[PDB]
Amino acid sequence: MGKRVDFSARTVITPDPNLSIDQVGVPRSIAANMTFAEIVTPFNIDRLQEL
Amino acid sequence: MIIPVRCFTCGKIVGNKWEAYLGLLQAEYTEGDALDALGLKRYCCRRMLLAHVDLIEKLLNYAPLEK
């Protein structure tokens, strides 16, 4: 019913009024560790190659 | 531990005032007279010496690691 999951981070929250309600600020350390899998396509092939 | 070099708020140098402050307190001077004898007009700088605890003396009572 509940279990540990990959691709999850946790840290302390702090206020920030200078971003919309749908935005959330995350540190570069967290963003540089958690990954998202993009499928290559001729549209983004050059961008992903550079990445 | 030791007196900070500068006041956290102002930034005025306070690191050289501690020994003179203790010397003045080793006299008839009160704290309020010693502080402005040292030239501390702002309470930001005054609290730096008024509330400082000098723990380096308690630290020096222990024998060092080497000789």
Binding site: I30 | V5, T30, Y43, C44, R47, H52
Partner: protein, 476 residues
């Protein structure tokens, strides 16, 4: 009572209790009875006298100690049983005088009502001006405020040791701190707080810090973590400290082992980081397999000192302590002496920070919306008395039930030093320079830095290690 007050046969700890309406008269001598000292009151007068106070004030020469005071028959130890059958007075002056009579039959008086508090609650300035859950939270967070926890912290090889660079005794203090030795090993810095809504980065119980003050060393601390290891365990599987060599030992991390000395340890004073070997230990393989201790991930400190010795089994034993300073960043949990906790929301430099008519910029800005529901009026009175004390040159007195100091007296004292009598000041906006339309409440307040840093809580994961029984992600 006569024998107990002279310690002839009955010792002081023994409690005699007479139930009157029900004829029992009980005497208790067993251990575990909790009791506190109380003054002795005859007709309407204390047995404590000017002569007692004088001969005890000149102590360390007349050696008239508390034991001699007890032997004089001036104080007794009263437990709860005997506290039921006795009549106390809070203050001899205010409760033993001719007036509209309330009791006129007192038996004991309290030395000072502030002694009903504990240790962590005796450091709260003006604790009777706060809502009680605030005081409870401050008593809980006083155990987490970082400071010089002990004088011999450098010889003390200890895990999770936290010391602050520049601890300060509070500008406003209770008379009970000198007995807790809080003014000798304090945990906190007398910060200049401005209770104002500056930008909105402190809205929900958060706080702005002065980046320039932090650069100058404000609430800067160093984190000591110690690592222990001992060699040994079988007939031939002998543990040994050495530098693991790739062709010899089989199992190795990608971590660089050159930081180790050839005896298997790091010399103190070497920069270290996550996944860096600290103790090179290998076990013989029936070539060899290592059991080297790795530095905890994302610590990134510096080795302080390395000690080698023998445990009680005569095997080589090593403990290594690592320094890592913790510069106050946003998210670090800060709190006052009134249960007003909060994490740093943003750090502005001195230019960005509001300022008085002088160049005084608040080290800390907290949201005013934290006062009205929490009702920490003790926090406001502390912030006022701190300014009064830092201007007068005296250390402020915040004894709970003093009754000799109040908001009106503190305000009148402050008005003499060129400030608004209620502590408010006219700050100027740090960005535009326009003076803020409202006047800002500002003054020195004793804030504490708690152990709950954000670098010790932040972590992520992307398909990391896995448990052994069920192939789910690990925990911790």
């Amino acid at each position: 009572r006569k024998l107990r007050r002279q310690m002839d046969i009955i010792v002081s700890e023994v409690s005699m209790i007479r139930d009157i309406r029900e004829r029992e008269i009980r005497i208790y001598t067993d251990a575990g009875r909790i009791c506190r000292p109380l003054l002795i009151v005859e007709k309407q007068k204390l047995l404590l006298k000017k002569r007692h106070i004088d001969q005890l004030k000149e102590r360390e020469y007349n050696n008239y100690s508390w034991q001699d005071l007890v032997a004089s028959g001036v104080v007794e130890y009263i437990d709860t049983l005997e506290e039921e059958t006795v009549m106390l007075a809070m203050t001899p002056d205010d409760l033993q005088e001719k007036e509209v009579a309330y009791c006129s039959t007192y038996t004991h008086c309290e030395i000072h009502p502030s002694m009903i508090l504990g240790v962590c609650a005796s450091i709260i300035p003006f604790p009777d001006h706060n809502q009680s859950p605030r005081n409870t939270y401050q008593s809980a967070m006083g155990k987490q405020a970082m400071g010089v926890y002990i004088t011999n912290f450098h010889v003390r090889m200890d895990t999770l040791a936290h010391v602050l660079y520049y601890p300060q005794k509070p500008l406003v203090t209770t008379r009970s701190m000198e007995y807790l030795r809080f003014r000798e090993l304090p945990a906190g810095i007398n910060s200049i707080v401005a209770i104002a809504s500056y930008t909105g980065y402190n809205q929900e119980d958060s706080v702005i810090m002065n980046r320039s003050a932090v650069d100058r060393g404000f609430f800067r601390s160093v984190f000591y973590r110690s690592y222990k290891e001992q060699e040994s365990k079988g007939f031939d599987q002998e543990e040994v400290f050495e530098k693991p060599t790739r062709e010899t030992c089989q199992g190795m991390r990608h971590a660089i082992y050159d930081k180790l000395d050839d005896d298997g340890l790091i010399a103190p004073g070497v920069r270290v980081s996550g996944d860096d070997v600290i103790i090179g230990k290998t076990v013989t393989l029936p070539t060899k397999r290592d059991c080297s201790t790795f530095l905890r991930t994302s610590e990134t400190g510096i080795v302080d000192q390395v000690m080698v010795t023998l445990n009680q089994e005569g095997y080589k034993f090593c403990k290594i302590r690592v320094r890592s300073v913790r510069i106050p960043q946003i998210g670090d949990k800060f709190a006052s002496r009134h249960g007003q906790k909060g994490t740093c929301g943003i750090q502005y430099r001195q230019e960005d920070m509001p300022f008085t008519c002088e160049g005084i910029t608040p080290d800390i800005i907290i949201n005013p919306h934290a006062i009205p529901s929490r009702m920490t009026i003790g926090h406001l009175i502390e912030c006022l008395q701190g300014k009064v004390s830092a201007n007068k040159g005296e250390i402020g007195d915040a004894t709970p039930f003093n009754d000799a100091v109040n908001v009106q007296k503190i305000s009148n004292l402050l008005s003499d030093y060129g400030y608004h009598l209620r502590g408010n000041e006219v700050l100027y906006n740090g960005f535009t320079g326009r003076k803020i339309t409202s006047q800002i409440f500002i003054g020195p307040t004793y804030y504490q830095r708690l152990k709950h840093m954000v670098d010790d809580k932040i972590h992520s994961r992307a398909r990391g290690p896995i448990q052994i029984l069920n192939r789910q992600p690990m925990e911790g």
